[PDB]
Amino acid sequence: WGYGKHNGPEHWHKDFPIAKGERQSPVDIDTHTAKYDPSLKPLSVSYDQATSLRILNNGHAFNVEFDDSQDKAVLKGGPLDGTYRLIQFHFHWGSLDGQGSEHTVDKKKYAAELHLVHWNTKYGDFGKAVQQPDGLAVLGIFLKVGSAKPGLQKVVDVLDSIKTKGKSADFTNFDPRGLLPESLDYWTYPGSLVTPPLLECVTWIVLKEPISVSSEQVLKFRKLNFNGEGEPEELMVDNWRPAQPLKNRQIKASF
């Protein structure tokens, strides 16, 4: 599985039948169809005590991992019930500024998309959570090309060290609060992971307001390799999946 012509998203179903399930992600968010739900509570992002450990290239993206042995970085409120712990955050981008996001807004595609992954602590470990319908909460943030995101530079600068698959590097004292937009207005629907196993255990929280990054920032992302060290170089670009059918599900808005 990958994003190539032969192992791309159109092929995942072979291996992962759930690929053509009822609550697959990503999706196109029709803003005219989204339902304003007044019963929706404000998001509660507590990341002041966040502990980042490292960054690694897993061959499909680069993940910044956090210490989730305690309620240090959590997400609550909104459409959620109980506390969700931050375990990792990563991105999805394109070969061009014209594509890269997972989710689309009225068919519009962004440069990239940030996923902050949290797991329902009632289930004890990530592993068990991914086996429940209310197992995960993923915070989705759109990235547009414009002005630099100061808070993102610490990450861009470390990319050289994890160019190939299986590389990792210590990445302590990184504050995720620097990647958040000003407003926390969101869209929410019941979905799945956007990559295999594509388990349907995610509660998506898509922020309305995108953050901007400079052309130079996103460009460094495109210098990554899907391949392992000493193998033919395959640039890590377009690690996104085509939008899926909403199939009855309803997209709710907090605004």
**Cα dihedral across residues 38, 44, 192, 89: positive or negative:** positive
Going by C-alpha positions, the residue among 157, 173, 61 that lies closest to residue 114 is 61
* Rounded least distance, CB 212 to Zn ion, Å: 20
Residue 165 near Zn ion by CB under 5 A? no
CB nearer to Zn ion: pick between 171 and 204: 204
- Contact segment (CB under 5 A) with Zn ion among 109-117, 128-136, 163-171, 197-205 equals 109-117
Give whole-number Cα distances, 209 to 14, 17, 113, 183, in Å: 36, 34, 12, 6
| Residue 32 appears among annotated catalytic residues | no
Nearer to Zn ion, 40 or 52 (CB): 52
Nearest approach, Cβ of residue 62 and Zn ion (Å): 11
Note the residue count of the chain: 255
Asked whether 56 and 168 are in contact (CB, 8 A), the reply is: yes
For 71, 79, 115, 162, 187, the CA distances from 30, given in Å and listed in that order, are 35, 19, 20, 37, 10
How many residues form the binding site for Zn ion (CB under 5 A)?
1
- Cβ-in-10-Å burial (0-12, 13-18, 19+) of 167 comes to middle
- Only one of the segments 110-118, 128-136, 168-176, 244-252 lies at the binding site for Zn ion (rule: CB under 5 A); that segment is 110-118
For Zn ion, the closer of residues 23 and 115 by Cβ is 115
Catalytic residue among 32, 60, 90, 115: 60
First and final CA of the chain: distance in angstroms?
A: 38
- Choice between 210 and 233, CB closer to Zn ion: 210
User: Do residues 91 and 122 lie in contact, with contact meaning Cβ atoms separated by under 8 Å?
Assistant: no
Nearest-CB residue for Zn ion:
115
Q: From the CB of 199, what's the least distance to Zn ion, in Å? A: 13
Footprint of Zn ion on 111-150 (CB under 5 A): 115
Q: How far apart are CA 212 and CA 110, in angstroms?
A: 10
Q: Tell me how far, at minimum, the Cβ of 194 lies from Zn ion, in Å.
A: 5
Per CB under 5 A, does 241 bind Zn ion? no
- List interacting residues with Zn ion (CB under 5 A): 115
Q: Which residues are catalytic?
A: 60
